[PDB]
Amino acid sequence: DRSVVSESTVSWAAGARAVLRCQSPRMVWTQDRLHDRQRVVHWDLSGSKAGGPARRLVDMYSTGEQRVGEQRLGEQRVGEQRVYEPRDRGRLLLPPSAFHDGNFSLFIRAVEETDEGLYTCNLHHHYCHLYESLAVSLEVTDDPRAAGAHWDGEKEVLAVERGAPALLTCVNRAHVWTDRHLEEAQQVVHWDRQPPGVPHDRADRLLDLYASGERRAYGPPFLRDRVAVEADAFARGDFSLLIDPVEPADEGTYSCHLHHHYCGLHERRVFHLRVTE
Ligand SMILES: [Cl-]
Ligand SMILES: [Cl-]
Ligand SMILES: [Cl-]
């Protein structure tokens, strides 16, 4: 199984070949022909009366390639919802242009006995490989005095009168899910370091790595000749720092910043490096 070490204290002897592991499968470069720039939302129901199969109720895509016959007019993100049972057409509705502002709330025009169960609002990003989901509980009651809604500490719990409409809230306004976005820049990795006992925001740049293969090194020649990252880092998502040879002056805090702003990816691997001998 895969694990993520986000911060660690490591000791290397002076003169050794130190390796500071920085890796991520989401920082792997792929060709444009494989990019599936598509966001999908779908509501699923794990019914309590059925108690077995969890069926999909309705989904909505963000992007598509408009055609007229065999002529490909182009691709532009628009949007359209699709119910999976022809009977729910007109009964289950999502907000129009849901991906414009991140409002994916499910509207049920008139709840039925078979609508009872645990709902899930699921977001899929095929380009950024993101999966987000929230749960909503729905109970159908015949007593209107019991109809209402409350937050039980983790999810919305609905109690709807039979035949009455319901709204299952699902809102995610993060830029990766909405149509708004800054122009996508290539993936970039930043290595920096600071002496022991110094806050992170006062670190000195050590090395920049861009997905196109371009790199930028900092520091005096004595430091640059001992610090490197193996070639084709973005081909395998490995940006591990190589310090060879490691010196007692290299003792300090090292940071590996992984950036893919278009996908909301901003992670940091921290290394408190100690040098013995
Ligand atoms: Cl076609
Ligand atoms: Cl019913
Ligand atoms: Cl590279």
Side-chain angles (χ1 to χ4, degrees):
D1 295 88
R2 174 185 174 268
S3 64
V4 179
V5 179
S6 59
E7 182 176 12
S8 61
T9 301
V10 64
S11 294
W12 299 83
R17 187 177 190 268
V19 180
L20 283 62
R21 184 79 198 278
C22 188
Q23 55 84 22
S24 179
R26 286 177 160 84
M27 293 290 292
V28 175
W29 182 90
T30 58
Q31 39 192 348
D32 295 308
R33 52 203 287 263
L34 301 179
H35 296 168
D36 186 11
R37 298 190 173 277
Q38 180 68 247
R39 290 157 290 154
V40 180
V41 63
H42 64 93
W43 282 87
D44 294 1
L45 173 60
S46 56
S48 59
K49 273 103 178 188
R55 59 190 179 98
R56 183 171 299 181
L57 307 174
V58 58
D59 61 11
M60 173 185 285
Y61 280 53
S62 67
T63 320
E65 188 200 82
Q66 290 300 112
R67 302 177 180 179
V68 180
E70 298 181 17
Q71 183 176 358
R72 300 163 75 167
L73 192 58
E75 171 195 31
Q76 197 251 5
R77 44 192 65 172
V78 188
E80 189 154 350
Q81 74 176 25
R82 186 175 307 174
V83 305
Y84 281 68
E85 290 197 2
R87 177 171 154 277
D88 290 332
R89 181 177 176 85
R91 209 173 65 90
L92 305 183
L93 296 176
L94 301 183
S97 300
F99 287 100
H100 172 67
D101 55 357
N103 192 330
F104 311 101
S105 303
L106 176 58
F107 173 77
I108 305 179
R109 193 182 181 103
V111 297
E112 298 167 354
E113 189 75 295
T114 52
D115 291 328
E116 215 178 55
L118 181 61
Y119 290 68
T120 55
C121 178
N122 307 272
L123 287 173
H124 294 258
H125 204 307
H126 296 342
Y127 175 72
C128 295
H129 301 91
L130 296 178
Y131 172 64
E132 181 77 4
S133 65
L134 61 89
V136 174
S137 178
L138 203 161
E139 175 182 346
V140 178
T141 177
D142 296 84
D143 184 11
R145 281 156 289 275
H150 72 270
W151 171 270
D152 66 350
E154 65 175 19
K155 64 178 180 301
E156 184 183 17
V157 181
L158 297 187
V160 190
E161 189 180 359
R162 192 183 309 271
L167 178 63
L168 292 76
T169 296
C170 182
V171 172
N172 197 318
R173 308 197 189 279
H175 73 261
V176 70
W177 297 116
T178 65
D179 290 356
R180 74 161 185 92
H181 68 276
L182 298 178
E183 54 169 347
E184 177 172 3
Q186 55 181 342
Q187 300 168 330
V188 61
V189 177
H190 293 150
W191 276 101
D192 47 71
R193 71 170 187 177
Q194 74 256 23
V198 168
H200 282 273
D201 59 90
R202 314 200 191 281
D204 307 314
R205 293 191 199 174
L206 186 59
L207 187 59
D208 301 338
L209 301 92
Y210 295 90
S212 61
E214 176 182 359
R215 300 182 181 183
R216 181 173 173 180
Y218 305 84
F222 171 78
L223 177 63
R224 298 179 179 175
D225 297 358
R226 309 180 297 101
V227 173
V229 174
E230 295 184 355
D232 285 74
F234 285 88
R236 62 185 180 277
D238 196 328
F239 314 93
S240 299
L241 194 68
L242 304 183
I243 307 177
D244 191 7
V246 54
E247 310 281 49
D250 297 329
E251 182 160 310
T253 295
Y254 292 72
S255 294
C256 180
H257 294 84
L258 306 169
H259 292 293
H260 193 185
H261 180 79
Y262 182 85
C263 288
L265 197 160
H266 304 284
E267 296 179 352
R268 185 178 69 256
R269 265 57 156 176
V270 181
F271 300 87
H272 306 298
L273 172 63
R274 299 176 179 179
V275 184
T276 51
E277 298 178 355

